[PDB]
Amino acid sequence: KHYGITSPISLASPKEIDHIYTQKLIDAMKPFGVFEDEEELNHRLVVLGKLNNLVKEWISDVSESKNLPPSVVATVGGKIFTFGSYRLGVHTKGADIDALCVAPRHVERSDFFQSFFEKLKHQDGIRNLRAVEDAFVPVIKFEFDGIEIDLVFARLAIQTISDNLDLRDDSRLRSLDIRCIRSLNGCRVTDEILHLVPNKETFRLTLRAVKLWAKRRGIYSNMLGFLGGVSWAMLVARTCQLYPNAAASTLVHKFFLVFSKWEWPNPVLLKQPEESNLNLPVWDPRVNPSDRYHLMPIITPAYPQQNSTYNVSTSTRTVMVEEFKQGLAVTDEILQGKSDWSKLLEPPNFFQKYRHYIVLTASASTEENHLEWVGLVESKIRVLVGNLERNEFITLAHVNPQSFPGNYVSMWFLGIIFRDLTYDIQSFTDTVYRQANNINMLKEGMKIEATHVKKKQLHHYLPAEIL
């Protein structure tokens, strides 16, 4: 009948001024690079066309190393799907593209990472080729004519790949390698969200706004314990179901209304979960004590449903809840004509709202040396936060998920609220090198350093943004 697990909050439709507020929203948003050009969209279209054709090509090549009847190798399909930002149609200028390669019976996960990997290496505009198959979802990353692409692979147990395939079917998962299942998950979730939303135009616009808000406001980063794309996509989709008729302007407002009242850890669900005979691991605190401890459950709607915000510590949950409420306050003003959309988008006073900080400085000798190391460090920051949260005297450890520059360097800043932390820090810096050694990764010239700084002393470290 309606969409979500609950009947909606209101069926109110917009009047002339709500349309006015929406236009102002679009106009506030343009200068931030949120909307791509005809040229850009088309470029993505052209690049993706090739990739697809390569995949259709390569799935034919492999199909002849196995000598199938030539009236079948022709029938053999192959397809590329997108998911994430780009597929949601809300990606920004410079956005990567998350893509999924779907092959038939005769193509093994082993093939994609050796032979098709060899295929890409040779193609004209492909740079930065690299496999990461140890990773949670096995991916091949590259840039194709300047588009960052994160290509992921799945092997289905069918003969062909109907150019109009449909991944939403749960029967597909039956008897599949957990590797193949996690690989289908991306599309499955993305496509599920689009289907669980009553209006796609208003969903997208609202999503674009909310994501901009999150970024500008310093709470966009799954890594560093905040939320990423799929999470914001899901929250905006839940809001859309509750107000199936609103304008984006209203939807951005209601979003803040809804998710500042929201009683955590009530989970955010987009559909009524069904059970299957499939018996896969699933988020469920009613059978998993580990799940009880997730602080801000935002649950993926495609089977098997998982939480997407495992990374959220208490501090980040607390920081975000405050931001939610700030959004509610500013949007109360905006929908009355008393404030402009820009006020919603102002950066927060991070470098003044705290009495103490931690400057997390990370250094390397060469460029390739830097990028890699910065990778490692950044993936470990959530640990320092963790240490700090277990500290008796600490009330909040707030990481700003934007690194800055200053030989190659990068720094992050944590803000702290109390009720001498050099050894919460040591154990962190120690832990980083220590684990860098475990992977035989730490090369000379790669330093990491963390100094506690009072506010009064901050300006010695504050970089270029001092404006």
Ligand SMILES: Nc1ncnc2c1ncn2[C@@H]1O[C@H](COP(=O)(O)OP(=O)(O)OP(=O)(O)O)C[C@H]1O
């Ligand atoms: N918990 C999850 N469940 C299902 N899919 C996920 C999950 N986490 C990440 N993904 C998927 O992996 C891909 C890349 O992640 P991500 O880049 O954070 O999202 P996104 O929607 O593409 O937004 P951005 O590209 O960062 O602007 C696309 C996304 O749908």
Ligand SMILES: [Ca+2]
């Ligand atoms: Ca992406």
